[PDB]
Amino acid sequence: YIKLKVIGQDSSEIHFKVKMTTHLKKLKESYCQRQGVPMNSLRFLFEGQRIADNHTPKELGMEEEDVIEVYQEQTGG
Template identity: 65%
Template structure:
């Protein structure tokens, strides 16, 4: 394997949060996005289930890879807080 081929196995990605903060990752083209999502969540101190990751407007699945998503060097992943629906019940017991 040449040095050029070895270098092409990796891709740099920007993960941008709702507050426009950026975290940069260098990952293999065959790395599952679940690993990147988990790493980002740990850095932010939140659970990965509380976040939604989008690339080109589509939600990213854990088992997808940059290669499958046709990502290129310096592409951006957007991260949003997951909206949770909470229903409150009020009852009076007499």
């Protein structure tokens, strides 16, 4: 499977095992649950652009050992 690296503001680099065919929608929501917060509370940034729920690793140009950033939305979700 493809492994993406999640970079947090607390200076952390978590490994994220994603499947090339699975909608990022599922990956995003399930990761929020692992964090302990509801979805839409955090925004996933890839190359500066926010990863939409209706996106897949096939597009954008996601590769192995990639870097994905996560920040908290102003609304809080």
